[PDB]
Design a protein around this ligand. Structure first.
Ligand SMILES: Nc1ncnc2c1ncn2[C@@H]1O[C@H](COP(=O)(O)OP(=O)(O)O)[C@@H](O)[C@H]1O
Length: 313
């Protein structure tokens, strides 16, 4: 069906506290409100979404949205539809340091694993609990980075510009991008890390880079009668670029993001590549900063998140 949209507000960072910023994001129910610091007179505009996560405070707080809480709703839902044979897409949208990479990948400790790891772990959990001998599964994963229209394989750095292609009958694809068959959450977890630090001004991870991690979940159902049925699902869990080198992919997105449900799909590697996410079940988690000093940026995203929700594949 349509596209579920979720938003999140993180705690203050070092920069926000160093400027003594104030919280300008409020949330109650599924509705999030935002206040204008440089115009405290204007009416705080409120937006409503499928999820308005409050994670400003801390895991000590009761009304804090733990990453386990955000997975269970969105993630644990997409896996369900993946299993249902459907194509899924979860992409973190936001400002640099807004909380995308923490929402998606997160941290390896304190039960701080983002959406991605939780989906993986849950995928294999759901798989080894399989009693029906008539079932066999296949799980091949990829993990690339799109830094300014160029595609870079995070799992095979031992090489690349990697061209994005368009199969005459099988849509776009990054040729020579590796796909690695895994047989456990451990094997698919290593690929993550080794692929993580891989990612290509500012310090650490380039603000302007998209990191797509895709899983081709393949299910095989046999039966003595007498053919084995096969239904495959493609799982795209993305980590978009800071919504602000060129990374006009994200800007090109805004255009594609609009006109929900022509469309300049080929104006950017990202928009073209995730063309189907089309026939797919997509989720968008917008990462928001509680900082007043982010008035515009934070508002922008919201407006973006409000439009995306208006989509429906
Ligand atoms: N929900 C959250 N809970 C706790 N800390 C968060 C949360 N979201 C962001 N942060 C903090 O902010 C930092 C950066 O957020 P990050 O996910 O890296 O942003 P981005 O992907 O946009 O660059 C992390 O080091 C993390 O501690």
């Amino acid at each position: 069906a349509s596209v579920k949209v979720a938003v999140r507000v993180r705690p203050f960072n070092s920069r926000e506290m160093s400027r003594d910023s104030k919280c300008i994001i409020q949330m109650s129910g599924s509705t999030t409100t935002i206040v204008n610091p440089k115009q405290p007179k204007e009416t705080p505009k409120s937006f409503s979404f499928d999820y308005s996560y409050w994670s400003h405070t801390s895991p000590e707080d009761i009304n804090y949205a733990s990453q386990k809480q955000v997975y269970r709703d969105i993630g644990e839902e997409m896996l369900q539809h993946a299993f249902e044979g459907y194509n899924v897409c979860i992409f973190a949208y936001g400002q640099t340091g807004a909380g995308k990479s923490y929402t998606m990948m997160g941290k390896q400790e304190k039960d701080q694993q983002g959406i991605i790891p939780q989906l993986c772990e849950d995928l294999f959990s759901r798989i080894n609990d399989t009693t029906n001998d008539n079932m066999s599964y296949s799980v091949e994963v990829s993990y690339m980075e799109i830094y300014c229209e160029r595609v870079r394989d995070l799992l095979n750095p031992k090489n690349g510009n990697l061209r994005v292609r368009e199969h005459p009958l099988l849509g776009p694809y990054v040729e020579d991008l590796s796909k690695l068959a895994v047989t456990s959450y451990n094997d698919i977890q290593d690929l993550m890390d080794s692929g993580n630090k891989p990612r290509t001004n500012m310090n650490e991870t380039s603000s302007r880079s998209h990191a797509v991690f895709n899983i081709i979940f393949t299910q095989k159902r046999h039966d003595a009668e007498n053919i084995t049925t096969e239904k495959v699902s493609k799982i795209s869990l993305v980590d978009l670029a800071g919504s602000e080198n060129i990374n006009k992919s994200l800007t090109t997105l805004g255009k594609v993001i609009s006109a929900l449900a022509f469309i300049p799909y080929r104006d950017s590697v990202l928009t073209w590549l995730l063309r189907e996410n089309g026939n797919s079940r997509t989720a968008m988690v917008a990462a928001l900063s509680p900082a007043d000093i982010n008035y515009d940026e934070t508002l922008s995203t919201l407006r973006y998140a409000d439009r995306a929700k208006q989509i429906r594949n």
